[PDB]
């Protein structure tokens, strides 16, 4: 993807006007610097490889992190899967209106000792379970629940000290592309909710300890990383200016277009 | 000459004598749905003379302290003739449009409009916890107006109409990435845009999804000396192109 | 029992690696594709579209539509300055938040030419001529029309065609330049001066406005992707 190179120019005195155009037509001018001045013939070897859509988006970025405690009833985490609880991955995906990509998940699970009271604690290595529940499946309500059998639900097991786990998810959707914006309602009577939450049904993700609470409580924390692969993007869109406030919608507080300087001639 | 056009659609004609060129979509022309991409199994209805014609919306006055206007336009034509009657009896529907904004002034006035047609414009509410209601988002063939000030957060369900943020929380100067034209009263006199069907599904219900939004924002405001005509109106005519419908049922 | 040997760099999580991973849903059937209009293949055609630049930041015009309007009147002297700003498309707050400056803040290096289109949004009976100069660095900012005529300039005559493109060239010692504010890789200044006056007839308003656009040429390039400094977060959005 090499860029175009400038050609040689000559002093002209003619009736052709490359500099004068008409911007009311909605058409940007296609001039190069060899029309308004004299230029030498250079040849560029610069490539546009890093500004591609695949190189811009296919990088891992965190989306959520949740904690859970070992020696505690109802200590387990859940997360409805959405890509708009962070500030930096949400801004990159909202440069386009429609996207279509495959995923690559990665979990980074840590642990920390809690202030117990038993003398000379000693615990073996911990094993975690991360279950994915598609929209409509039965959900667990406690830790030693029957729903962690995973008869059809895909889950992963991981022992502490190894490499982090990693799966891959294809393009799961009802429509032909993921939609980042939706100007409409859910009900046909145009009541109730309005925005992007109508099309978000990716599913839920559950996390727990497998080992029992031996002698000291242990609080773990799992971070979730998204990585889009094989990305196609349609209908570009201006980048977000105001700060994000909520998750379900695009509400904002008004702000100036730039920061101000003291004059129009100041540098 | 390159300043004259004539658009013929059905039993209606639009002529213009000074104008810029026309802007067609993202490079494509509106066409019908092919057999590779269809998902409905029943036969669609293509009337194509009763619905593909020019419908003229209501006029708005360009004052000196004007901020902007916006239409939605699957909803602006919901009461317009036989286009609004096929929208009620059918469940699905796809269409492309051609939009013609027109505003005339003499050689002694000055101003500049930005005629931009954006897809999927989610508008923000004034209160940060709520979403705006239906009557504040779109009126039937009547413009909703921006403001040059900020709507306070005491209002429950009202659209935030700060014009420099364009209601969507983006810079208003960066709205030129969508298909657009300018109406410069020095040279131009009317703007024309041809838009295809842009959606992530091949067909959509036309009553709970507005897949377009036409914004007219005066960047350089209207100004004239004393003596010239103080009343300058703006008129918008929209014509559907290649419309078809599926799923016939009762009236709704 | 093939004898292997694990190298350093094993069992690490590098966030920019291209590896294969086992799929969670085997034999899944995706939804077939559809010809959606407006497919973008590269980010260098988003930066090649014109966008209005807020030249007029005067501490109360940033929260208004007056930031984009450059005031031009009928003067009583010769050679007055219209505007002026240094050419930094990623650090200077004039070109910072445009369509070009919001892509340059995701990358670190940039190289290429920059177009600057001006539109005269005045009356149809007004005339005038302007000088659109660009001075490479090494000296200061030009303070006269005599100092600014010695650089790369173009003389714009208003008329039927209401736009003029000043295309600044790529004059530098290095192949690339830094996006952030640096003194070693400075780029210069862009100014505007009255060539002749703005002459209007009677009953015509003598105060006209000028819009300015900015884009990139066909030899623009960026490198070394980074994170943007314009977004920030304290807690999760919920």
């Amino acid at each position, epitope marked *: 993807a090499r860029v175009a190179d400038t050609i040689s120019s000559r002093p002209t005195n003619s009736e052709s006007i490359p500099a004068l155009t008409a911007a009311e037509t909605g058409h940007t001018s296609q001039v190069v610097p060899s029309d308004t001045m004299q230029t030498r013939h250079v040849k560029n070897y610069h490539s546009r490889s890093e500004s591609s859509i695949e190189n811009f988006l296919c990088r891992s970025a965190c989306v959520y992190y949740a*904690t859970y*405690t070992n020696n505690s009833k109802k200590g387990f985490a859940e997360w409805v899967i959405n890509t708009r609880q962070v500030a930096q991955l949400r801004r990159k995906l909202e440069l386009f209106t429609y996207l279509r990509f495959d995923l690559e998940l990665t979990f980074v699970i840590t642990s*920390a000792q*809690q*202030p117990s009271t038993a003398s000379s604690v000693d615990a073996p290595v911990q094993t975690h379970q991360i279950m994915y529940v598609p929209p409509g499946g039965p959900v667990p309500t406690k830790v030693k629940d029957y729903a962690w059998q995973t008869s059809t639900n895909p889950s992963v097991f991981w022992t502490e000290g190894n490499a982090p786990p990693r799966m891959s998810i294809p393009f799961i959707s009802i429509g032909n592309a993921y939609s980042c914006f939706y100007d409409g309602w859910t009900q046909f009577s145009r009541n109730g909710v309005y925005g992007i939450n109508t099309l978000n049904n990716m599913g839920t993700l559950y996390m727990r300890h497998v080992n029992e609470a031996g002698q000291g409580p242990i*609080k773990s924390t799992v971070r979730i990383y998204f990585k889009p692969k094989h990305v196609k993007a349609w209908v570009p869109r201006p980048p977000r200016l105001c*700060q*994000y*406030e*909520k998750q379900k919608n695009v*509400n904002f*507080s*008004p*702000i*100036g277009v730039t*920061t*101000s300087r003291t004059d129009i001639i100041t540098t | 000459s390159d300043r004259v056009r004539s658009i013929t659609l059905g039993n209606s004609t639009i002529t213009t004598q000074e104008c810029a060129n026309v802007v067609v979509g993202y490079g494509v022309w509106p066409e019908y749905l092919k057999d590779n991409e269809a998902t409905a199994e029943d036969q669609p209805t293509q009337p194509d003379v009763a619905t593909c014609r020019f419908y003229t919306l209501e006029s708005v006055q360009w004052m000196k302290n004007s901020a902007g206007w916006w239409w939605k336009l699957p909803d602006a034509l919901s009461q317009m003739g036989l286009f609004g009657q096929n929208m009620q009896y059918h469940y699905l529907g796809r269409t492309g449009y051609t939009i013609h904004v027109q505003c005339n002034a003499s050689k002694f006035h000055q101003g500049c409009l930005l005629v931009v047609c954006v897809p999927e414009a989610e508008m923000g509410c004034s*209160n*940060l*916890n709520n979403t705006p209601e239906f009557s504040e988002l779109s009126g039937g063939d009547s413009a909703r107006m921006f403001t040059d*000030t*900020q709507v*306070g*957060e*005491s209002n429950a369900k009202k659209v935030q109409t*700060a014009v420099w943020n364009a209601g969507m929380g983006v810079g208003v100067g960066n709205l030129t990435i969508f298909p657009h034209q300018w109406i410069n009263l020095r040279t131009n006199n009317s703007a024309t845009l041809v838009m295809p069907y842009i959606n992530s599904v091949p067909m959509d219900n036309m009553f709970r999804h507005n897949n377009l939004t036409l914004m007219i924002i005066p960047f350089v405001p209207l100004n004239y000396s004393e003596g010239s005509s103080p009343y300058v109106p703006i008129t918008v005519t929209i014509a559907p192109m290649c419309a078809e419908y599926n799923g016939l049922r009762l009236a709704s | 029992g093939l004898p292997v040997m694990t190298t350093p760099g094993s069992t690490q999580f590098l966030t920019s690696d291209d590896f294969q991973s086992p799929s969670a849903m085997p034999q899944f059937d995706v939804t077939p594709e559809m010809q959606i209009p407006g497919r973008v293949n590269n980010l260098m055609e988003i930066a090649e579209v014109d966008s209005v630049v807020p030249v007029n930041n005067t*501490e*109360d015009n*940033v*929260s208004s539509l007056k930031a984009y309007q450059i005031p031009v009147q009928s003067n009583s002297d010769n050679g007055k300055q219209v505007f002026g700003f240094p050419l930094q498309p990623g650090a200077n707050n004039v070109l910072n938040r445009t369509l070009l400056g919001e892509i340059l803040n995701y990358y670190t290096h940039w190289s290429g030419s920059i177009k600057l289109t001006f539109m005269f949004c005045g009356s149809a009976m007004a005339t005038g001529k302007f000088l659109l100069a660009y001075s490479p660095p090494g000296a200061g900012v030009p303070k006269n029309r005599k100092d600014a005529m010695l650089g790369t300039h173009v003389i714009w005559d208003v008329g039927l065609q209401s736009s003029c493109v000043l295309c600044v060239p790529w004059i530098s010692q290095t192949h690339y330049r830094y996006v952030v504010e640096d003194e070693y890789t400075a780029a210069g200044y862009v100014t505007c001066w009255y060539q002749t006056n703005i002459v209007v007839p009677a009953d015509v308003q003598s105060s006209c406005d000028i819009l300015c656009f900015v884009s990139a040429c066909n030899d623009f390039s960026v490198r070394m992707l980074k994170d943007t400094p314009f977004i*920030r*977060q*304290d*807690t*999760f*959005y*919920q």
Partner: antibody, heavy 117, light 108 residues
Framework: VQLQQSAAELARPGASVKMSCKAS????????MHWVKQRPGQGLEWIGY????????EYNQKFKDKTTLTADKSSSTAYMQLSSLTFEDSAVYYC???????????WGQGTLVTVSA | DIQMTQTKSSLSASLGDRVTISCRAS??????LNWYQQKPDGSVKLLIY???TLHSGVPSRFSGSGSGTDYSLTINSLEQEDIATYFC?????????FGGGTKLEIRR
């Protein structure tokens, strides 16, 4: 990253005071600046906010006719003027920087306002 | 407005005890609650920015619960640096209404 307020004030009944809350460590014209009043016998009480970029202020229904919130861009401070002081205006006033929609993450140390003779 | 009421206003427990502070609303605020902590020298800081989501930089003794109208805040092991005043704040309707104070002390 911190906010610093003024000292403790003292004024006659009917007079006017002007507090301040200098912000540092972040871009001042991005987040809104809120003011919270705490009487010593009650809980916290909201007064209003001000958008420092557009100079738009919005007050509560009780504190509308007394308080006035101003700000400046150069020194990166945010002022607040109380007028027509009565005996129930003797309290502690905090400044807070509003984060995402409904939470305040950074607070001030508060100034003590008293009225007497 | 939404009247955020804490009927406790004073609490007493020994060191190493589990305390519970409850805040009750006027109507359903739909999980939009925040918990703050006011130290006796005047400093206020945010503890839990949801019903149960802990802020960064807060120790893990704190935990929140509740749904609908009734809510709670729990410290499972009371320390010496936790002796402060705790407030609840809703973020559902305009304006923001704070709850009453709740001061903690030692048992005997």
């Amino acid at each position: 990253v911190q906010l610093q307020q003024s000292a403790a004030e003292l004024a006659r009944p009917g007079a006017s005071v002007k507090m301040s809350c200098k912000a540092s460590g972040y871009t001042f014209t991005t987040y809104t600046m809120h003011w919270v009043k705490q009487r010593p016998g009650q809980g916290l009480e909201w007064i209003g906010y001000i958008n420092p970029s557009s100079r738009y202020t919005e007050y509560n229904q009780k504190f509308k006719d007394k308080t006035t919130l101003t700000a400046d861009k150069s020194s990166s401070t945010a002022y607040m003027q109380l007028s027509s002081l009565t005996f129930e205006d003797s309290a502690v006033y905090y400044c807070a920087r509003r984060s995402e929609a409904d939470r305040f993450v950074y607070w001030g140390q508060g100034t003590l306002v008293t009225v007497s003779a | 407005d939404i009247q955020m009421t804490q009927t406790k206003s004073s609490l007493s427990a020994s060191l190493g005890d589990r305390v519970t502070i409850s805040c009750r609303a006027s109507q359903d605020i739909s999980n939009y609650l925040n918990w703050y902590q006011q130290k006796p020298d005047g400093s206020v800081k945010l503890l839990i920015y949801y019903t149960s989501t802990l802020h960064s930089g807060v120790p893990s003794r704190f935990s929140g619960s509740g749904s609908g109208t009734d809510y709670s805040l729990t410290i499972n092991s009371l320390e010496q640096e936790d002796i402060a005043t705790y407030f609840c704040q809703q973020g559902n309707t305009f304006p923001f209404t704070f709850g009453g104070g709740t001061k903690l002390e030692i048992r005997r």
